[PDB]
């Protein structure tokens, strides 16, 4: 018995969604009065009103702090405006690639996914709001644009404050609205089952079972670093799986992420590395507080950057039912990603499509049937099983490649480079830079590879030469909605199949040098002294250090 009140608020200006959503600090979402409310009534008055009863949204987040705060606002708002129902995972807790899952599972219209992702989380953290669809991906910016412009306009939303949900049981609780015929329902399922039970008919787990148990056991350990994959690591990897207990680490969702950033990386995941460099283990993994990053790890400490993950997991594909029953229909990667894929692609007659950062570009491929596997720089990877990212899937994927390769993570990669030759990479990252010089930067280089005769001219280091094949500021025709990205990064790319590229997003300039070694002498050598003549190339064409002031990058992956 609960009622419908619509509340005149005042409309705020900078609720843009962009293709990650609403990202704020806590204390915006707090002490701005309606902060909240107002962005969730616009997600929902952009859902036609002759569809709501019928309608499923699919709501939970990664656990940060103010997490169920927000889900109570969302399923006060959606009941008040005859949305149907809510799908919300226990204690409000669903990963990023789960609530993808459920949505495509059950044929919601989309979801609400409360997270930062990778952000730190806390009262002096961050909050986001990020809004599916109903193919499970992130919605476009045709949606986009639909909710900031209600958003900037928003004099009022609809709410039951009364309606109060209980997230920790199991079941279904039902909302009897003041004037309305149709109850509002909501469904509490438990977070990691629908996920588990997709990734259960992905993998072999019968397979990964063996692999993980026995004395003769594959040892690893699994970093969630204190979000949202925690219990999807304990219910999947050590009770089905049966992967020990002490392989679960961090594997209990906290408001604060422990006080660090749920970021999987080398600085980030330190923790996770020292115990990898012990020596006592075979693989080792972390993830990002929504779950659709990953880092993967070999004895040792190892370190498999995302863009060789990518190649070797296509290079070894059919290991994974999923692909053996379905095919591959393509290869794919972010422009500024190295080309290590690309030569797994290459060998395979299986298309590979370069595309600009950001997701639309993966889904829009993958709903045409034409992209099976993708990685994006910033450790991510995926697969068509989703129209997002999933972290936990990929460390399933390498698990299923170490068991049927049955050789050490390192071992593999050496005999990948000996195949494909090695892609050395790294990414530099000049960050707060004076916006003014860094664009300067940029137009200077842009103008300077767009002479005539820029093509051919020939750069030496160590003697080392290379000679200039293509230069360009990146641009992409996508195949199925017509859309054209321009601006999107400057490329220098070499007749010996390296390359340099230069991106901005104060402003962040970012470096990404990509060179190729066929020869098995240099194939394994530390990846910063093999590049360090393109780097050094790098800098001088474009000058940065004359254009920033900075003899540095901040970060160095
Ligand atoms: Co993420």
């Not at 499923?56 to 705060?69: P, Q």
């Not at 005859?82 to 799908?87: A, K, N, P, T, Y």
């Not at 002490?246 to 992420?257: K, Q």
């Not at 980030?268 to 020292?274: F, H, P, T």
Request: hydrophobic share 40%; charged share 25%.
């Amino acid at each position: 018995m609960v009622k419908i009140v619509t509340v005149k608020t005042q409309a705020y200006q900078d609720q843009k969604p962009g293709t990650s959503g609403l990202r704020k600090r806590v204390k915006v979402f707090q002490s701005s009065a309606n902060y909240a409310e107002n962005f969730i009534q616009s997600i929902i008055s952009t859902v036609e009103p002759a569809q709501r009863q019928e309608a499923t949204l699919v709501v939970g987040g990664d656990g940060r702090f103010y997490m169920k705060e927000a889900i109570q606002l969302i399923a006060r708002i959606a009941a008040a405006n005859g949305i149907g129902r809510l799908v919300i995972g226990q204690n409000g807790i669903l990963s990023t690639p789960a609530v993808s899952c459920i949505i495509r599972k059950i044929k919601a219209i989309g979801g609400i996914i409360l997270t930062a992702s990778h952000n730190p989380g806390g009262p002096n953290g961050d909050f986001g709001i990020k809004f599916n669809i109903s193919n499970g991906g992130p919605a476009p910016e045709a949606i986009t644009d639909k909710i900031f412009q209600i958003s900037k306009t928003i004099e009022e939303y609809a709410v039951c404050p009364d309606l109060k949900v209980d997230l920790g049981v199991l079941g279904k609780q039902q909302f009897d609205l003041e004037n309305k015929f149709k109850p509002f329902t909501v469904e509490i399922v438990d977070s990691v089952e629908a996920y588990a039970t997709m990734l259960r008919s992905i993998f072999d787990f019968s397979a990964l079972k063996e692999l993980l148990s026995g004395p003769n056991r594959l040892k690893i350990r699994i970093d969630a670093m204190h979000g949202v994959v925690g219990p999807y690591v304990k219910k999947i990897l050590c009770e089905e799986l049966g992967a020990p207990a002490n392989s679960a680490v961090n594997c209990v969702p906290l408001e604060d992420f422990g006080g660090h950033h749920p970021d999987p990386n080398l600085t980030y995941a330190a923790d996770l590395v020292e115990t990898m460099k012990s020596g006592e283990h075979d693989f080792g993994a972390a993830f990002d507080g929504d779950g659709d990053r990953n880092m993967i790890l070999g004895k040792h400490g190892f370190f498999v950057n995302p863009s060789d993950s990518v190649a070797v997991i296509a290079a070894n594909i059919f290991s994974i039912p999923y692909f053996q029953q379905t095919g591959v229909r393509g290869f794919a990667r972010s422009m500024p990603m190295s080309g290590a894929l690309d030569r797994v692609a290459s060998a395979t007659k299986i298309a590979l499509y370069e595309t600009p950062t950001g997701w639309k570009f993966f889904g829009n491929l993958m709903d045409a049937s034409k992209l099976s596997l993708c990685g994006e720089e910033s450790f991510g990877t995926g697969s068509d099983h989703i129209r997002e990212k999933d972290g936990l899937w990929a460390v399933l994927a390498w698990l299923s490649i170490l068991a049927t390769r049955k050789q050490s993570v390192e071992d593999i990669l050496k005999d990948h480079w000996q195949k494909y030759g090695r892609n050395f990479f790294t990414r530099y990252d000049y960050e707060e830079v004076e916006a003014e010089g860094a664009n300067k930067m940029m137009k200077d280089l842009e103008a300077l590879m767009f002479d005539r005769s820029f093509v051919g001219k020939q750069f030496s280091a160590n003697d080392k030469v290379y000679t200039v094949e293509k230069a360009d500021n990146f641009e992409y025709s996508d195949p199925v909605d017509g859309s054209i990205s321009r601006n999107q990064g400057l490329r220098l790319i070499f007749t010996d199949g390296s390359r340099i590229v230069f991106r901005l997003s104060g402003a962040t300039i970012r470096l990404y040098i990509d060179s190729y070694e066929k020869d098995v002498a240099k194939i394994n050598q530390d990846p910063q002294v093999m590049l360090a003549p393109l780097i050094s190339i790098a800098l001088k064409v474009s000058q940065l250090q004359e254009r920033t002031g900075r003899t540095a990058p901040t970060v160095i992956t």
